[PDB]
């Protein structure tokens, strides 16, 4: 249950930031000595709560969905990925033409979009593409911006390799994406250049 | 990655209730037509946020911790289990004498306490015991109250059996607890009586 626990640790870490923020915000509201910050506290509760909703709507499909056969609308996927990009620096350029997407496609695309975002820790553009053609659905996310970089744990996860030294959270997501694309019969590919990275997957459709 | 995804689905489902509540609460604050409920809305945001913190502090150790060697204080565990019992009907009677507990003991006890609570869907007492003796640490939770009941999915999970028809959320927790107690070298036992159930585990210590 080592894999499962690492994924749970990931989820907990992402949710804990905005949840702590709400708590803090409300502590400030009640503290008779911080009345100078009432409005910033109230804004922080509102925004954190929105951040949490966005992260939970996303995590339910990206991580929580089952292997079971089910189509999603790509517009709804755009919406989930847009929600997660709202709370980090890079911008999202979603280019999948609206259409229904099978379940591996859908779990795959959401994960790919976020790995692309977290490859851009000083901003940039994550361009998301996805075409149904030739008995497949083929996804590619291009991340572009300063110091764009797939960390080593991400790359080892995307190849299904154990985690060496590097962070569990980035890894578990990448390995999870690898395992689900392999169980589906497809393949992961990566490109790395100067100020750029891209992550690609195909799956049968 | 089927097991991992089910655990993620569990986590998401538990967190989504109070997070939606906060969102709703704040929608009521802003809605110029529900000003009649301003105080109940504000109370609901405060309480939901507290519920979330309690669930996240608990989930980080119950689910998120690694197999890696690490002691916890039982008082701190009491605190985590108390937090989760705050948001359901049954009451908790923690009887572990304060002492350090190894990692399998600790993941085990937290899970056992909550399974005991969710066995009491119309209230009652979950009594939690835990003794270090004879090269072991041995935990038992007794749930007592009307219609106390280990559901079939819980029992199949506690034995490591696949999930048949029954709910994924109760199951995944029980299987996760089984896998971690087995990887540690210990065993799970269950008792079932009228208006009572108990779940027990030992692990080497
Ligand atoms: Mg996440
Ligand atoms: Mg939970
Ligand atoms: Ni577009
Ligand atoms: Ni006590």
Author numbering:
A (entry chain A), B (entry chain A): 21 to 225
Published text:
At the core of this circuit resides CtrA, a response regulator that is able to bind DNA and act as a transcription factor, activating and repressing many essential genes involved in crucial cell-cycle steps such as cell division, DNA replication and the development of polar structures. Phosphoryl­ation of CtrA is carried out by a phosphorelay composed of the membrane hybrid histidine kinase (HK) CckA and the histidine phosphotransferase ChpT. ChpT does not belong to any class of known HPTs. Its N-terminal histidine 33 (His33) is the residue that shuttles the phosphate, while the C-terminus weakly resembles an ATP-binding domain. We have demonstrated in this work that His6-ChpT, an essential phosphotransferase that controls the phosphorylation of CtrA in C. crescentus, adopts the class I histidine kinase fold, with a four-helix bundle flanked by two domains displaying a structurally different ATPase fold.
There are three His6-ChpT subunits in the asymmetric unit of the crystal, corresponding to a Matthews coefficient of 3.3 Å3 Da−1 and an estimated solvent content of 62.8%. Two subunits form a homodimer, while the third subunit exploits a twofold symmetry axis of the lattice to generate a similar homodimer but with exact twofold symmetry. A fluorescence spectrum measured on the BM30 beamline allowed us to show that the only metal ions present in the cooled sample were nickel ions, which are presumably derived from the purification procedure. Each subunit consists of two distinct domains, an N-terminal helical hairpin domain and a C-terminal α/β domain, which are connected by a short linker (residues 84–91). The dimer interface is exclusively between the two helical hairpin domains and the twofold symmetry axis runs parallel to the helices such that the N-termini are adjacent, forming a four-helix bundle referred to as the dimerization and phosphotransfer (DHp) domain. The DHp domain contains the two H-boxes, with each catalytic His33 located on an opposite face of the four-helix bundle. In His6-ChpT the ATP lid is substituted by two additional turns in the N-­terminal part of helix α5. These turns occupy the space in which the β- and γ-phosphates are usually located in the CA domain of HKs. Also, there is an additional short α-­helix (α4′) between strand β5 and helix α5 in ChpT, which together with the latter helix closes the ATP-binding pocket found in the CA domain of HKs. In His6-ChpT the two domains adopt a compact conformation, with helices α3, α4 and α5 from the CCT domain lying along helices α1 and α2, leaving the five-stranded β-­sheet of the CCT domain roughly parallel to the helical axis of helix α1.
